[PDB]
Design a protein around this ligand. Structure first.
Ligand code: HAU
Ligand code: HAU
Ligand code: CL
Ligand code: CL
Lengths: 290, 290
């Protein structure tokens, strides 16, 4: 077989494989469970860690440690409920209220990413982790391997000069520049569609039109019998995220302002899950005195 | 004022400014002239040097040395005829035969770049250097600061998976992927237009239509009185490079196969300029013996 590097074994007791490969481990210092992501041997790994260290949001996975050996070892927090994929696999569908609670968190997470100049680019049910086995739980976005950092573009520098020698396709690209983040909103629309209905909107199963053609036209597979169980507001949101034009597509802010997300009961349940997890971390408070 | 770093002064005697800032210097070891490009203080500089060290073509400038101090110092070969810009500034126009000789070299240089996965992205008369004050001379492409290296794209990796969650604009982008190099061919068409005519094809002078609009429509300013002096073959080539669609636009290979470049006299003059410059470098030959 092979062995774990000495530096890792020093701080962690390695255990069972959880699914790159992810292993269960125990931090020796605390006796607490962690998840260790093993990445076989680089440029994406450098960016991934850098992104993970900068982010601080309750709906985004946190990096605990990192080891650079024969393979890369990213120590992450352990999520007991596993992937959202396992709750939707086959034709399993979540209760609409459960969809809302998880979707709201996904929007807050993606909104936080976009506010911080990060595009995930790989949002899918297998990259959404649940904090517990209970259906009302906190969710965390993970797997920042395909992610991209937004900064000052070469296009922005190109536009500071005279376009005497500049090609027309560069000038045509100015119309869409800065809409890259809209790929996350499309992905969010696909996750929401799956969660609400139990089936994917674009599939090669029981159809002639190519997957490519179903996507570029945005003609999702609508099954009325399945969707009758779902509210009009929920479907209206899916429809606004599954828009072909990335400039007309709903952003995370527009999705958060949508009537389907104006649910104080869902919001209170989320605030209740937050404070319950924070209860262990919470240091005493400097309180005002009259 | 300021001073040059000790490591540079050790090998070079710094002299007059030639124009970032470029200074004339003398290599102490050989007593030969060099040009030293001073870049004030990074990511483009790293890529520029890396590109320059890899390239070996007679129509591309060579890096001789590099110093990483308070500012970056790139030691390059000295070109005695200066920039092609100075031969075309105002309404100065080169003889058609001189255009051909210089253009042919620019095509060989750009073809070599494209074959080696490099896109220049900043081709213009000020980035073309002449080897001598004589009109029949060797030309060198310079200023690789805006250049881009072509490798395995994120798109190529994205297409290896199922597009269930993939946004339509990513799939739409597949049509044009890999045509980035065509920006150099557009720039070459603009340089050729200027060289042949003495005036730019797109200008804000004496017109109402915006520079952007003249470029995206590809409606260049054609002055028949100026172009009557020029051959139909030369204009036909300009027309094939100044094509709006980057997929229909002439590539360097198509431009090299164009009837205007099928001139053995021009080719012989280029081969004659090559061997004359190589004469000093030429080590003795291992010759066959019957
Ligand atoms: C069956 C079980 O005991 N599970 C379900 C799966 C779960 C799991 O892989 N979490 C996980 C995976 C990756 C990351 C980064 C975090 N957390 C552990 C508990
Ligand atoms: C007037 C004169 O003596 N010139 C014309 C200008 C010329 C010149 O700047 N070359 C140059 C500039 C940059 C680089 C990289 C190489 N080479 C030196 C000779
Ligand atoms: Cl081991
Ligand atoms: Cl000095």
């Amino acid at each position: 077989m092979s062995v774990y590097p000495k530096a890792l074994r020093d701080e962690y007791i390695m255990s069972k494989t959880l699914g790159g490969e992810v292993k269960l481990a125990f931090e020796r210092k605390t006796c607490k469970k962690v998840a260790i992501k093993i990445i076989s041997k680089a440029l994406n790994v450098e960016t991934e860690i850098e992104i993970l260290k900068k982010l601080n949001h309750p709906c985004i996975i946190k990096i605990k440690n990192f080891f650079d050996a024969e393979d890369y070892y990213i120590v992450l927090e352990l999520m007991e409920g596993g992937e959202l994929f396992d709750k939707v696999v086959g034709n399993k569908r979540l209760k609409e209220a459960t969809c809302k609670l998880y979707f709201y968190q996904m929007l807050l997470a993606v909104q936080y990413l976009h506010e911080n100049g990060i595009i995930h680019r790989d949002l899918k049910p297998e990259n959404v982790l649940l904090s517990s086995q209970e259906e009302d739980c906190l969710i965390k976005i993970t797997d920042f391997g395909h992610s991209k950092i937004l900064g000052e573009t070469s296009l922005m520098r190109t536009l500071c000069g005279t376009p005497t020698y500049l090609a027309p396709e560069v000038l045509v690209s100015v119309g869409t520049a800065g809409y890259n983040r809209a790929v996350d909103c499309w992905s969010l629309g696909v996750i929401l569609f799956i969660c609400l209905s139990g089936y994917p909107p674009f599939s090669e199963h029981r159809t002639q039109v190519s997957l490519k053609d179903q996507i570029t036209s945005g003609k999702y597979n609508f099954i009325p019998e399945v969707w009758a169980e779902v509210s009009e507001k929920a479907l209206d949101l899916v429809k606004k995220l599954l828009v072909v034009d990335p400039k007309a597509r709903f952003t995370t802010e527009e999705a958060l302002r949508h009537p389907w997300l104006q649910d104080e009961d869902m919001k209170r349940k989320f605030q209740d899950l937050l404070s319950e997890e924070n209860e262990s971390t919470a240091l005493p408070q400097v309180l005002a005195q009259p």
